[PDB]
Amino acid sequence: RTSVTFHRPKTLSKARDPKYPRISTPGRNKLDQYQILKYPLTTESAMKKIEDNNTLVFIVDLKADKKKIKAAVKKMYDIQAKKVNTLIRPDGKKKAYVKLTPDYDALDVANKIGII
Amino acid sequence: PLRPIVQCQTRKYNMKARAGRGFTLEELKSAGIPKKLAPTIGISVDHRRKNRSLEGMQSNIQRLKTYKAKLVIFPRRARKVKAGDSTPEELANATQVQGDYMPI
Amino acid sequence: VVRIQRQRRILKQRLKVPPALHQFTRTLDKNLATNLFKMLLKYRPEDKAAKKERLLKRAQAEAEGKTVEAKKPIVVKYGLNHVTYLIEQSKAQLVVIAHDVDPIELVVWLPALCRKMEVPYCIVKGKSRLGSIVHKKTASVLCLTTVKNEDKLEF
């Protein structure tokens, strides 16, 4: 030896090789697009937002985040979001403001879903 | 199972006979019934008692002989009747005696 | 773990070992031990793979011949209880004691028993090396009770 301190030698370990999976079923995606966009909020405030800012205002799942919100607004509606803002309403539900790229028109999307 | 006539302890009750716990090894041997077989056929065995009197031994030996006299034993199987069994013709009237079948 | 096991031999050196335990560390010589182990290697027990065949090939003798033609094999005996029974019944011709048995009380009493039942005994070095003779991890005692007629002089 050279150093007067003894250290635990580098052993070799194996990664897990289970003989039977502790979970058989594949976990279903419970935050699918339909749980993650419950419904577009249609109060007069969001109504004015539709034309003045080209944004759709949704009530979204409380466990959703901006990444999943954009990914979901892309799969539904065949659109994409330039930006998304989220707040949690006092009533408990999360409300999301989805601002569209200017290629897409919020009035056309909101008429193809039916809000106005 | 069968129980022996024994004396009580204790000057107050020394003369008053009562049912004990089991026949001693001496008693089983002299009545011709093996140790391990006696509890099988309804005869208690008390390896802890001691026989200190012929008066006690023959008193219980008469009980062993009486029990073997009026004992019936079904065969372990249906047709095979081995030694120590009993004949079907008198097996067919067998009943369940109720109460004390040998009073003391 | 290393520290206590080194201090173990240090403390066993410092303290005054009593005669009963000091009879150990006085082992059979190197040449004599190797020469004896040559013979102990000659008289090894039966392996497991070598024990399957002895029972598998008597099949023809048991199913068809209805005869037992086998003879007595000569092997070294082992196990503390079996060897102590043999030594007390005087069917032991030689006893081999491992010097390094832990706990030592398993073999402390052997030398007096051997000596006063008048049995040749040696304390060789290495219970693992004894265990190899019989294919177990530790053996702690061996004994020869009989040798083939072609090796009596050299025994």
Partner: protein
């Protein structure tokens, strides 16, 4: 048969050979943790006679306990009460150290069940016991009829509940006649029985 030899050699505990080997084992023990797994019994005969077997699932664990009595844990030796409960320093614990060691090993070793425990070595401050533990989820114990009785659920924490050899010793169950008639089924059971006011229906 060697176990008679080794048992008698452990009977002679003040001989020179045992003094030597027991002092050196005491030092080795004092240099290790309190609870340590050990591969094999140091007292094969004593372990066997208590139900140890060279079989998988029977483990041996060496337990250390301090000696001396139980000195009352009160904040400054102040015991608020009448003078007859006011002592501190000469009180004795009503469980023997063998039981204390079993009840240490039982708590630290949850998945195993305490079978027995036996003295191995002793000094001025610590007693060393070897506790035999049994792994009752292990098939080689499930398939041994002499030890299945320990796999039934009613034998959980025998050590913590007073059911082992030390348990019965300190419960005073070693005896049957007078001098031991109050301790059946237990001292508390007999106290309850003797205190129950039997008010018969037609009293």
């Amino acid at each position: 048969g060697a176990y008679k030899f080794v048992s008698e050699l452990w009977r002679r505990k003040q001989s020179d050979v045992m003094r030597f080997v027991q002092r050196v084992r005491c030092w080795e023990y004092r240099q290790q943790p309190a609870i340590v797994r050990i591969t094999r019994p140091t007292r094969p005969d004593r372990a066997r006679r208590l139900g140890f077997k060279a079989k998988q699932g029977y483990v041996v664990y060496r337990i250390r306990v301090r000696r001396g009595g139980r000195k009352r844990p009160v904040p400054k030796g102040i015991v608020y009460g009448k003078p007859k409960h006011q002592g501190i320093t000469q009180l004795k614990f009503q469980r023997n150290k063998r039981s204390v060691a079993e009840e240490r090993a039982g708590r630290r070793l949850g998945g195993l069940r305490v079978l027995n425990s036996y003295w191995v070595n002793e000094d001025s401050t610590y007693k060393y016991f070897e506790v035999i533990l049994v792994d009752v989820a292990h098939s080689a114990v499930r398939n041994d009829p002499r030890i299945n009785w320990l796999c039934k659920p009613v034998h959980k924490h025998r050590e913590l509940r007073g059911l082992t050899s030390a348990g019965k010793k300190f419960r005073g169950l070693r005896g049957k006649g007078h001098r031991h008639h109050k301790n059946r089924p237990s001292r508390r059971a007999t106290w309850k029985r003797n205190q129950t006011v039997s008010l018969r229906r037609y009293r």
